[model samples]
Target chain A: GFLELERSSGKLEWSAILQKMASDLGFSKILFGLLPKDSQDYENAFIVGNYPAAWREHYDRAGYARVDPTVSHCTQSVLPIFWEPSIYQTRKQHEFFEEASAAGLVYGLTMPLHGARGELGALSLSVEAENRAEANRFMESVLPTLWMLKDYALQSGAGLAFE
Target chain B: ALVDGFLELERSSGKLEWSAILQKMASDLGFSKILFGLLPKDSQDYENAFIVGNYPAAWREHYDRAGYARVDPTVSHCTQSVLPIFWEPSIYQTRKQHEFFEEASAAGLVYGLTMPLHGARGELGALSLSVEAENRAEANRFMESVLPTLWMLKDYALQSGAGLAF
Candidate 1:
């Protein structure tokens, strides 16, 4: 059923499809980032998902891309890393962590997908403290399907709208 | 045996505990090196990635400096496909890819098997196992048998990693 969406959905519908998928999986906040293939232009990359508007603006203005450890790891890895406070080892990073926590991201997880064309895609889901276990279970259960979605998003040749 | 390992992983809470199970799983499956990594969703940077296993420092450092992530075929293939990719010299279609293969092979990373996984909320993960041999039918059989365990390991690694701070 999910695979069919990959082939049938056009650019305009891609975001809606992913949004529905995220909600269906129990995550209230989702972030999808697709980097331009082997290029320096992050702007052209497909980045979308439903997250807090204020936090999104703050993250953009703060230029968290250069300092985000998870983002840095994605540049070099294909592993799924989780969001835990222990990850921020430095004082400056801890400051950022505090700011993020204040913005309602109590816990979260990220999936980093690097493509054959040197494209980078990261999907993150955020949740409240009470929903952590539910979010984790939902995520682990739907992993295989999400893997296919990464391929679909990249190969479907669709314009993944940015936030 | 594979199912048994998954069961073991289900209860393993910490990275150190999971390491024993994954390491044993990889070794039993005949791979010399095993690597797994993850990215967090809420953060813009890659700071909160969960990684485990012993990767060759020389090769890792070389790959980092050479910026091989751009041309490395394994990295690219995993992103677009869930199928496990085997290492082949001819897979290198570009000069940079060829160079990557050259150095990798020189460093005893001549053989590789990578399995990619995905989770809800755009969570992506991959497990890579490397060896030193050329291709063979036994290799094919081994890959087939290990697929189930790889699936379980991917989830276990993600779950266990999510619990830890690193």
Candidate 2:
């Protein structure tokens, strides 16, 4: 039913619906990006979020797509992951995080969302939280709910590769 | 009738009981091989890894010795989605990948289906069944009837460590 509402809302308004849902779920910043199983190019991918404009611009300019640890992990796993610094264990990974954090893309809970017929995506809920314990506790309760929302969002064509 | 056999396996414990039932299902389903492995997070090593299947010895040995897990399209497909992937010529999207499938086919490991598994603790696993069907449509029809049974087996096999004895 919620997915139907999203489907009817069209692209411009769907972003607003998702942003409100993400905020209600305890994260102020949300990013959802998806690619089909057959393609790795961004042209075949779609992204939507309320993240800072400068962060998005810098993220693209720096060519982070090739080195973002989260993207690589999302490509290989369906499990939700909290941003663990050590898990990214590489020089490039370390550098990517340094830049990301500098750009205010800090704490996060991310999931590799999947859909029928070869759709794949990642949903990252970023927070400006300082207390790790508090952030994680909030994440634990919301992860499943986020999973459902991600599926609904995709089914509603929110993550379809836009022209 | 084997669905009833599978129902019993659901309550059964350990690798021994589950494996026996799995073997029966494999035969009844006309599969030539089956592989079920739990791919855990946070570790790259396969230590204490739980996996079991009726794959041919040569193919299994070659697959292991080559360390092909990193390159196997099936493994990548399983981990990234819950969708069931059917093995077909189209799946070999790369030149090098075709070599892997060719070798597998030589070993009678032709034609397969894979299902990815997910757990609440973030555990990841996959169960793949292989058949030698010449007609893809025949295989597809058979798969629809057994999907539920395979789903149950995947769940039990994960918890009972029945499918984990690699």
Model 1, residue B71: C-alpha shift (Å): 21
The residue pairs that clash in candidate 2, if any, are: B50-B164, B51-B164
Identify the leading candidate in terms of TM-score: 2
Question: B1-166 in candidate 2: lDDT tens per residue?
Answer: 4436656666667776776777677767667688877755434343334667788767777787787666677777766555567887788778767888888779876677877655323456668888767777877777666665554454444444422432
Tell me the TM-score of each prediction against the true structure.
Answer: 0.51, 0.51
Report how far residue B125 has shifted in candidate 1, in Å. Answer: 15
Q: Candidate 1 DockQ category?
A: incorrect
Candidate 1 lDDT over A102-134, as tens digits, reads 877667777675543345667777765466576
If candidate 2 were superposed on the true structure by all CA atoms, what would the RMSD be? 12.2
Candidate 2's residue-wise lDDT over A1-163, tens digit each?
A: 4554445455667667777888987888988787765567743357778878787777777767677877776665554578877666789889888877786666787776554435567778887678767777777667556755654565554334432
Fraction of real interface contacts that model 1 preserves: 0.06
Report the Cα lDDT for residue A24, model 2.
83
Chain B only: TM-score of model 1: 0.76
